[PDB]
Design a protein around this nucleic acid. Structure first.
Ligand code: MG
Ligand code: ZN
Ligand code: ZN
Lengths: 18, 1183, 528, 100, 49, 92
DNA sequence: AGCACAATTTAACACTTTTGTCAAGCGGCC
DNA sequence: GGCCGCTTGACAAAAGTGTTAAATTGTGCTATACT
């Protein structure tokens, strides 16, 4: 429930690299 | 100069750099590998970095400095902060922040247009679109709409909380409009509510500067405090403080951001690393929503961040206001003993050496004793046990110098008082018995905070008003207090209970027959009539009104008159029949004050007993005495009041309460009726339920009969023998307490709610069946958890009472008010449509010394208007009430006066204490709280109704009432047993369920519509469909019912002066020049905007209705409010706008440090009084 | 019977017997199985400052199976408080409401006495700047009161010490205050020089008039002591003190009737029984008898009964011991009591005859035979005439007398009292709290201030926040004034208010001292 | 470093002591009075020598230049102060200002 | 909490702890004075044990 | 109570105005100059302890008796509050 | 879990010099 | 002629400048494992 989730949803929304 | 008003509100970010200037930055290290103090960062002494060798330049002079290394003549050694304020800067420069903005949609939503999501952008998780370039999807916008990706769909643009600062001037230039085009939204209903709140918030920025600097860009904490050094003692060590660590999560975050931003830092990384910064802000402000424990991820104690501690709940606001820390007092145990009845006290003979040491030292300086004051500080420390000469000089200091004794807990004005310290022996601090009745507590090791006033201007200000021999005789409430408490009553009651021992009924030819013969056997000195009198002919006490009845007290001393009132003829002032026993009483009060002339016409004789009437004697005496003499009485009734019981003795033997020999068979008939209702079951008659309550009522009645039989058995025979009645009649006993012992009381009810089957075989003398006590305990449980639960909610409600009425003080002189209130002389009874005498107990204390609204004509002389109708006039109206001349005695109540900032002069008839009109300075605002500050403990919170009406909270079932007065209209159906009310107009539909559906007819103004038997619909509807007519009175009548149920002494305007506060606020409609159509202006203050402007603009209003807690959140000042349960929204609304605090207010002065506007510091008592005759004569020419 | 063994307050006896006890402080052994010496707790120590002891009861040999009592017990019988002859009656008012009366008889025999212990601890910190060490040559403290009962530092064991004395005079090089200007004079004037350690000692707390039982040096260098890091020499002394019995304290038997000792009149006065034995304790009603009715008096009637008849009846809850049971007992007790008198050389007293004239009409005693029987029935449900040693004439009326039970609660008076002046102080909090000499404290309840202002008290009310407490820079004004001369105290300068303005200044809020002129905008805080 | 302030946690204080300040000026006033029985060519000497006038701890060297005479006799007055002043202490209680 | 300082005032005091029993502690039946609705939770009960 | 306290209320229109006068006088009745009391003859308030008869160090009591001799005066009079020092100056 | 290099920086301690204090000698006054 | 006071010389004790020795940061960077 912490604000870390907000960033956890923005950090795990964009793919890495091939 | 002199302190006066106070200013606050927000402060632009530029103003923040003013008080703090600079000196900040660097980490928050509280120490180093070495040199625990300095750290050159956190709490670094301003310009102190090991050896700055500077900063001392700013200082003009005073002393030297600059010592190179170590430290110079700086503050670090002395004057370091000096407890003074020292702002830092915390630097800061990130995107933005937030000053908590409270939780009432302040600084946002109101000034903007977004709710339940205004934080989504303020916390860097959205995008407050604030630009116009023509969108595409669905036209452009001007608010939040780009929830991620959207703002990049076109790739100005603001996705962070920084936009809050951008909407500064953007809202400032539109501010004038936000007050015009916004208010442009006329009625239309519904939305006309937001326009009101939006205008109130923008009305602040409308003037007196105040910019939307809500978007903090640099915080400024405090360093001087938090820093507790090593604390050994007992069995512990180490130490520290807060405000520092919890603060480290702010600066460091700001720096790390300055390191990340400077270097390569993509959006995503900053958006989250920034939102934590503002989170730190709220973290330093108040920990909520989520919280921030220690030792993560482990959960423990919540970090203290202003919330509940400092500026918040009990932590630095509740403890600093009143519960501070006296630096001149002490505590001890309690004791009792004939001291002198008032004018004196106990106080130890050892500790007193410290309390009165100061002046005592100066005394010895000139009394040879101590050579100097310093030496006098080293002769009484090592407990050398002086006990020589010093104990004497101590008396001179403790001569006419009173001391303030306090009782914890405190309740009502009768919780302090003052006496004169009379050092006795040991350490135990004793006091006068009577005084206990004011503190409510049994001597069992209790303590009493012994405060001591220093300044001489405080001594006279005390002993002249706080002396127990003054403000204790006739307290507030309604009835006296100084009256002879328990014990004393039994010391005079044991001699007036008739001596009739039943001798028969003989006869003598004028005392020549049954005078000597009966003196041998049968027929003593009881009944028997002869010629006219009786056996009174035996010991004719001659004497006269010269030196008291000699033969009387003389014969009693010897083996003659058995005393204890044995019927005897005296001479006093006339040939009476009063026994030498009563003669003593009249003789005690005689020499006490002066001549029996007063006590003779006062003290009764027909019904002596000295029962619960001792409160009427002393009370009636005040009218012909006045402290000086009154005090003498409580002193005369003391010595004898205890000696008589001492040199007599009355024990409570197990047999003392003789068991009713005529009771046994009573239970037989009651039990013989058991089978009667039992066999009815085997025959199939009367439901099991009917049987239940059928047997209950049975024992509910027989109990009263048994009690009657007992009380009777203890009335006739066995007069003085039974002590259980000697105190029950009037001394220190309860009637229902008798039916318990010798009785049998067992009609106990189940723990939940259902009177048990078979009662309890009480009769203590015979041990219970081991089941009776376990069964009776179920009810003896609520009788303890309720009283102890009077500190859970009820105890935290009295505060609300003291807060409301606060600035109410009796001042000015004759205001002049037309409208008056007519107190009802007769009330109705819901049971039967018929008025009663109101039991008199309500009319008396309800008209005790008031202000006759108008001339009162009632058989004989007239009661001139504005006449102080004392107790006499009261009885004159009550006894003349039965005649049929008066129904509504005219009077002036505090509810009628155009003054909200002040009480009223001569309107608050009598100062219910000194038996005279109120004095200018009497803060009735606090006294009003002292009135209700007592019944609290004597209630039943386990259900609560007194507070229900205060907050104007809708009662149970709502108790629907007829909002209008139509006609009958009573239709019934199946489940719609609803009743309506109308007349040639519109008809309302009252969905009356299924309960108190009475008939009634011929319309009804409000009444109750029938279902509302008690606790009529919340006052909200009353005033809504009536006005300040029934509201102000309905309370004074209903609220008292909860007090009358327990027979309270208080009443009068004490409760009628607190209502004016909840009904002194009005709304706005079509105002004159004054902004805000909605508004919430106060009474008087609003009358001013219509008084001076009346000489021109119409400024109509409507009598609004607010609760008891609401009369605090929004007041003319701010220092008050908070406390209750909202010390967050208060300081908010309080800030922003100018909201300048008033000046006339008890707290305002106590807190700020000013002098009390009441008491002897009132604006009506600040003149000169020094003139030793020649002084005025000299200045006469010197001028 | 089990509260003494289950609680393990006392000891036990294993297998056979044959004690041959040597007693003292170490009970011998028993010829049952082996030789095991039973060492007493040696007064041990309490967590409430009481310290319990266990005295034995044997010699030569015996078994059954009690063996040495415990704290408050006697022969396997739980004895908490103490039972003493009492008498219900009012006396001048020394028992109003629900107070208690006590005689000097109890003190003469130290009937009511207890013991209170307290453990001290003085750690010698090492602030690096200057390590602390315990020595017997404290600077400036050069006196006899030291070398006499101190020496080598810690106080000698078994040395009676009073409050305001040294116990653990530790020396600290901690130099917080360098030499003062004009102070350097009074330092050179005398025969002494300067200093660099200061007095800084323990100093007995505000209440301790007893003796030491033993000390304990627990310094570092010993791996068998888990102490705080950086700490050296953890002195720990135990100070004892006899309690005796002054004034006050709570009695409260085993029914609810609780009170407080008012005044202890020395023998002389007090109701003198018609055969000596002056009433030791007087228990006047009021408080619980009539109001919160109870059953304690049922003990008094059976108290003196067991005194004369010489027995200690046992009354089990909800079983036996009833009103009629007292009748049979009272009979034997009477004839035994009056028996001595009637055979001592007298019988029935005038002052003991008039009292009957009371009960007679009072309906108490039935009229009939000589005073002999009237005094008998009066004893069954009551007591003898009884007199008054102070006044001179007997208390006209049937008064009850008998032994019940007078206990004593932990709450006393000595350790429940406090007094101070300007001595107390608690920097940062801006209020009297703490102190290395006096731990004084006093609170002014919120419900108290409102009452104080209710009166005309405006200067007294403000005073509570004027000089004392609040105004730190003002606390001097008064205390410095009176000591020098009269003069009227300062106008008042709140201290916490400055902290409130500061704490509230943490945010935008700007608490400005807006003057009555408005435009000037007064501000009092610039270091004056 | 402690749990900051668990459960105004720990009191303890001893810096701006009220009595210390009240006795500070007192002990000072006592000296102002105890110096009334002294001469300028002695009191002032002690003033400048034992740094009292303000804070300057000037020595006999600096006290001798402005005081006409040189070292010694201005030093024989210093001792004269230790004695002539001490001789006014053994007969007048005042040795209770050290423990402060 | 529960681990209160063993009242060693007297034998009976130490024994009353092992039988004292309570409802306050780590559970949700704590909170003195108030606590939602505990008025009829502390009252007597049909338990002669 | 106080010797003739009730008589003090009768004069003053308020119970609070009385207190002020009591102290206001005591401020310039013992502290200012112990020789400013109108009561000097045999009416001079005095104490009688084990030693002898002396004047009580407390002046608050003198005011109550001093404001009963019919002398003195109270109320709004003489605006110059700095003139009190002039009158007191003549009294050394 | 961490070692080094370097580099650089921080911290403190010791020297030779100077300053202060005490004793001795000389001069002046009685 | 003697005594007292003042001034100067000698001795002892404690500072400003120099000198060197011990610690932190960065960075480097290392380094190893997994994808
Ligand atoms: Mg109590
Ligand atoms: Zn410096
Ligand atoms: Zn009015």
């Amino acid at each position: 429930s912490d604000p870390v989730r907000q960033y956890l949803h923005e950090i795990g929304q964009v793919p890495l690299l091939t | 100069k002199e302190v006066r008003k106070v200013r606050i509100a927000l402060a632009s970010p530029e103003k923040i750099r003013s008080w703090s200037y600079g000196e900040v930055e660097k980490p928050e290290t509280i120490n180093y590998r070495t040199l625990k103090p300095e750290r050159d960062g956190l709490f670094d002494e301003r310009i102190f970095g090991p050896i700055k060798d500077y900063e001392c330049a700013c200082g003009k002079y005073k002393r030297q400095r600059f010592e190179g290394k170590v430290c110079e003549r700086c503050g670090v050694e002395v004057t370091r902060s000096i407890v003074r304020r020292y702002r830092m800067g915390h630097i800061e420069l990130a995107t933005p922040a937030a000053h908590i903005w409270f939780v009432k949609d302040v600084p946002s939503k109101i000034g903007t247009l977004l709710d339940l999501s205004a934080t989504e952008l303020e916390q860097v998780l959205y995008f407050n679109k604030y630009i116009v370039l023509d969108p595409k999807g669905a036209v452009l916008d001007g608010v939040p709409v780009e929830k991620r990706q959207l703002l990049t769909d076109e790739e100005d643009a603001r996705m962070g909380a920084e936009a809050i600062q951008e909407l500064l001037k953007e809202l400032d230039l539109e501010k004038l409009e936000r007050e015009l085009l916004e208010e442009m939204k006329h009625p239309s209903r519904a939305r006309r509510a937001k326009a009101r709140k939006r205008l109130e918030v923008v009305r602040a920025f409308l003037d007196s500067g105040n910019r939307p600097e809500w978007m903090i860009l640099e915080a400024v904490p405090v360093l001087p405090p938090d820093l507790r050094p090593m604390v050994q003692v007992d069995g512990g060590r180490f130490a520290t403080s807060d405000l520092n660590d919890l603060y480290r999560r702010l600066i460091n975050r700001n720096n790390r951001l300055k390191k990340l931003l400077a270097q390569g830092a993509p959006e995503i990384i900053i958006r989250n690393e920034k939102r934590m910064l503002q989170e730190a802000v709220d973290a330093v402000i108040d920990n909520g929503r989520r919280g921030s424990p220690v030792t993560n991820p482990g959960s423990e104690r919540p970090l203290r961040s202003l919330t509940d501690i400092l500026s918040g709940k009990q932590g630095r606001f509740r403890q600093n206001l009143l519960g501070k820390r006296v630096d001149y007092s002490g505590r001890s145990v309690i004791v009792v003993g004939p001291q002198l009845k008032l004018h004196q006290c106990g106080l130890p003979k050892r500790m007193a050496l410290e309390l009165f040491k100061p002046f005592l030292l100066k005394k010895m300086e000139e009394k040879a004793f101590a050579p100097n004051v310093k030496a006098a500080r080293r002769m009484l420390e090592r407990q050398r046990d002086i006990k020589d000469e010093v104990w004497d000089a101590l008396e001179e200091v403790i001569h006419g110098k009173v001391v303030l004794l306090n009782r914890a807990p405190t309740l009502h004005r009768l919780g302090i008082q003052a006496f004169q310290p009379v050092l006795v022996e040991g350490q135990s601090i004793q006091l006068h018995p009577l005084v206990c009745e004011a503190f409510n507590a049994d001597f069992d090791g209790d303590q009493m905070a012994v405060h001591v006033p220093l300044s001489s201007f405080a001594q006279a200000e005390a002993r002249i008003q706080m002396l127990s021999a003054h403000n204790l005789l006739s307290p507030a409430s309604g009835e006296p207090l100084a009256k002879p408490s328990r014990d004393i009553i039994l010391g005079l009651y044991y001699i007036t209970q008739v001596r009739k021992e039943k001798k028969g009924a003989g006869m003598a030819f004028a005392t020549p027959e049954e005078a000597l013969a009966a003196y041998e056997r049968g027929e003593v000195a009881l009944n028997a009539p002869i010629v006219v009198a009786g056996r009174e002919t035996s010991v004719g006490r001659l004497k006269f009104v010269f030196a008291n009845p000699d033969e009387a007290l003389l014969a009693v001393a010897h083996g003659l008159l058995d005393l204890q009132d044995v019927v005897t003829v005296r001479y006093l002032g006339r040939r009476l029949e009063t026994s030498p026993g009563r003669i003593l009483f009249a003789r005690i009060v005689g020499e006490a004050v002066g001549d029996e002339k007063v006590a003779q016409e006062l003290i009764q004789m027909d019904v002596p007993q000295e029962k619960n009437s001792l409160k009427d004697l002393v009370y009636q005496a005040f009218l012909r005495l006045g402290m000086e003499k009154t005090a003498r009485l409580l002193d005369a009734l003391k010595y004898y009041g205890f000696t008589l019981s001492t040199t007599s003795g009355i024990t409570i033997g197990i047999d003392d309460a003789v068991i009713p020999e005529e009771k046994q068979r009573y239970l037989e008939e009651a039990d013989r009726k058991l089978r009667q209702i039992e066999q009815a079951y085997e025959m199939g008659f009367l439901t099991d339920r009917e049987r239940y309550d059928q047997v209950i009522q049975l024992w509910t009645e027989t109990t009263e009969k048994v009690t009657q039989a007992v009380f009777k058995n203890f009335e006739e025979n066995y007069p003085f023998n039974p002590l259980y009645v000697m105190a029950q009649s009037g001394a220190r006993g309860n009637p229902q307490q008798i039916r318990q012992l010798c009785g049998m009381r067992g009609l106990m009810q189940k723990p939940s709610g259902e009177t048990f089957e078979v009662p309890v075989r009480s009769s203590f003398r015979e041990g219970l069946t081991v089941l009776e006590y376990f069964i009776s305990s179920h009810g003896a449980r609520k009788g303890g958890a309720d009283t102890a639960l009077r500190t859970a909610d009820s105890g935290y409600l009295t505060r609300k009472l003291v807060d409301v009425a606060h600035e109410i003080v009796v001042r000015e002189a004759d205001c002049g008010t037309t409208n008056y209130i007519s107190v009802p002389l007769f009330q109705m009874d819901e049971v039967t449509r018929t008025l009663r005498l109101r039991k008199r107990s309500d009319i008396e204390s309800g008209l005790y010394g008031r202000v006759l609204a108008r001339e009162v004509e009632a058989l004989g002389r007239r009661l001139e208007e504005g006449r102080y109708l004392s107790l006499e006039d009261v009885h004159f109206l009550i006894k003349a009430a039965e005649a049929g001349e008066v129904r509504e005695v005219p009077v002036r109540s505090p509810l009628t006066c155009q003054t909200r900032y002040g009480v009223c002069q001569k309107c608050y008839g009598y100062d219910l204490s000194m038996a005279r009109p109120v004095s200018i300075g009497e803060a009735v605002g606090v006294v009003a709280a002292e009135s209700i500050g007592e019944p609290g403990t004597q209630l039943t919170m386990r259900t609560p109704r007194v507070i229900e009406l205060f907050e104007a909270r809708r009662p149970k079932a709502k108790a629907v009432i007829s909002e209008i007065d139509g006609v009958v209209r009573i239709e019934e159906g199946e489940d719609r047993l609803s009743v309506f009310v109308e007349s040639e107009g519109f008809s309302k539909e009252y969905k009356l369920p299924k309960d108190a559906r009475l008939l009634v007819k011929d319309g009804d103004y409000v009444e109750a519509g029938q279902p509302l038997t008690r606790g009529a619909i919340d006052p909200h509807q009353l005033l809504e469909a009536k006005g300040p007519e029934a509201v102000e009175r309905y309370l004074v009548d209903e609220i008292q019912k909860v007090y009358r149920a327990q027979g309270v002494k208080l009443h009068d305007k004490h409760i009628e002066i607190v209502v004016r506060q909840m009904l002194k606020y009005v709304e706005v409609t079509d105002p004159g020049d004054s902004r805000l159509l909605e508004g919430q202006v106060l009474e008087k203050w609003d009358v001013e905007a219509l008084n001076e402007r009346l000489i021109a603009v119409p400024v109509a209003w409507k009598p609004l209705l607010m609760g008891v807690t609401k009369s605090a959140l929004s007041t003319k000042s701010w220092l008050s409010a908070a406390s209750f349960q909202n010390t967050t929204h208060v300081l908010t609304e309080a800030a922003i706008a100018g909201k300048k605090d008033e000046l006339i207010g008890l707290k305002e002065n106590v807190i700020l440090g000013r002098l009390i506007p009441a008491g002897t510091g009132s604006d009506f008592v600040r003149f000169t009084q020094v003139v030793d005759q020649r002084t005025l004569k000299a200045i006469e020419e010197a001028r | 019977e089990r509260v003494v063994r289950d609680s393990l307050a006392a000891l036990y006896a294993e297998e056979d017997g044959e004690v041959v006890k040597v007693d003292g402080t170490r009970i011998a052994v028993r010829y049952e199985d082996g030789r095991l010496v039973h060492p007493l707790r040696r007064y041990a120590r309490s967590n409430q400052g009481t310290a319990f002891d266990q005295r034995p009861r044997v010699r030569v040999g015996q078994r059954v199976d009690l063996l040495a009592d415990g704290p408050a017990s006697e022969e396997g019988f739980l004895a908490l408080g103490q039972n003493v002859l009492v008498a219900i009656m009012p006396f001048d008012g020394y028992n109003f409401e629900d107070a208690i009366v006590i005689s000097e008889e109890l003190l003469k025999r130290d009937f009511y006495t207890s013991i209170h212990i307290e453990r001290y601890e003085i750690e010698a910190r090492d602030t690096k700047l200057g390590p602390e060490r315990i020595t017997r040559d404290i600077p400036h403290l050069s006196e006899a009161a030291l070398r006499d009962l101190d020496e080598e530092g810690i106080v000698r064991i078994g040395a009676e010490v009073k409050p305001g004395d040294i116990l653990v005079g530790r020396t600290s090089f901690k130099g917080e205050q360098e030499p003062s200007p004009e102070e350097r004079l009074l330092r050179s004037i005398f025969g002494e020089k300067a200093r660099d350690v200061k007095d800084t000692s323990l100093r007995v707390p505000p209440g301790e008039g007893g003796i030491v039982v033993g000390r304990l040096r627990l310094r570092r260098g010993d791996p068998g002591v888990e102490l705080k890091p950086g700490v050296r020499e953890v002195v720990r002394v135990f100070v004892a003190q006899k309690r005796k019995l002054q004034v006050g304290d709570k009695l409260a038997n085993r029914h609810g009737n609780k009170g407080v000792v008012a005044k202890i009149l020395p023998v002389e006065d007090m109701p003198h029984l018609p055969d000596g034995t002056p009433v030791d304790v007087i228990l006047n009603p009021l408080g619980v008898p009539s109001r919160m009715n109870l059953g304690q008096i049922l003990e008094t009637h059976l108290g003196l009964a067991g005194y004369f008849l010489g027995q200690r009846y046992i009354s089990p809850v909800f079983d036996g011991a009833t009103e009629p049971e007292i009748k049979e007992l009272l009979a034997e007790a009477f004839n035994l009591y009056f028996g001595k008198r009637q055979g001592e050389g007298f019988g029935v007293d005038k002052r003991e005859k008039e009292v009957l004239a009371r009960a007679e009409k009072l309906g108490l005693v039935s009229p009939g035979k000589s005073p002999e029987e009237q005094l008998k029935e009066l004893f069954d449900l009551g007591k003898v005439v009884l007199y008054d040693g102070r006044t001179g004439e007997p208390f006209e009326g049937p008064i009850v007398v008998g032994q019940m039970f007078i206990m004593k609660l932990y709450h006393m008076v000595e350790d429940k009292m406090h007094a101070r002046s300007t001595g107390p102080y608690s920097l940062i909090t801006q209020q009297p709290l703490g102190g290395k000499a006096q731990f004084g404290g006093q609170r002014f309840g919120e419900m108290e201030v409102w009452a104080l202002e209710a009166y005309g008290a405006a200067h007294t009310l403000q005073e509570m926040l004027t000089i004392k407490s609040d105004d730190i820079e003002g606390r001097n004004a008064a205390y410095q004034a009176i000591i020098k001369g009269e003069d009227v105290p300062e106008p008042s300068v709140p201290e916490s208010f400055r902290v409130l303005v500061k704490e509230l200044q943490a945010l935008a809020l700007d608490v400005q001292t807006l003057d009555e002129k408005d435009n000037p905008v007064d501000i009092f805080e610039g270091l004056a | 470093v402690s749990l900051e302030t668990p459960i105004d946690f720990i009191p303890d204080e001893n810096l701006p002591s009220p009595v210390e300040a009240a006795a500070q000026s007192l002990l000072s006033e006592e000296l102002e009075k105890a110096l009334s029985k002294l001469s300028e060519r002695e009191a002032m000497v002690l003033k400048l020598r034992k740094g009292l006038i303000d804070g300057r701890e000037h020595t006999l060297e600096e006290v001798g230049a402005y005081f006409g005479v040189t070292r010694e006799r201005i030093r024989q007055i210093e001792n004269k102060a230790l004695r002539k002043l001490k001789y006014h202490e053994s007969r007048t209680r005042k040795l209770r200002d050290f423990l402060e | 909490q529960l681990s209160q300082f063993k009242d060693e005032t007297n034998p009976l005091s130490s024994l009353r702890h092992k039988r004292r029993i309570s409802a306050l502690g780590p559970g949700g039946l704590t909170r003195e004075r108030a606590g939602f609705d505990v008025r009829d939770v502390h009252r007597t009960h049909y338990g002669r044990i | 109570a106080e010797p003739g306290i009730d008589k003090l209320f009768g004069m003053v229109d308020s119970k609070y105005r009385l207190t002020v006068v009591v102290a206001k006088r005591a401020q310039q009745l013992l502290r200012h100059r112990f020789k400013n009391t109108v009561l000097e003859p045999e009416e001079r308030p005095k104490m009688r302890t084990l030693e002898g008869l002396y004047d009580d160090p407390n002046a608050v009591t003198w005011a109550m008796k001093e404001l009963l001799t019919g002398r003195l005066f109270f109320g709004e009079n003489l605006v110059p509050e700095d003139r009190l020092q002039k009158e007191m100056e003549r009294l050394y």
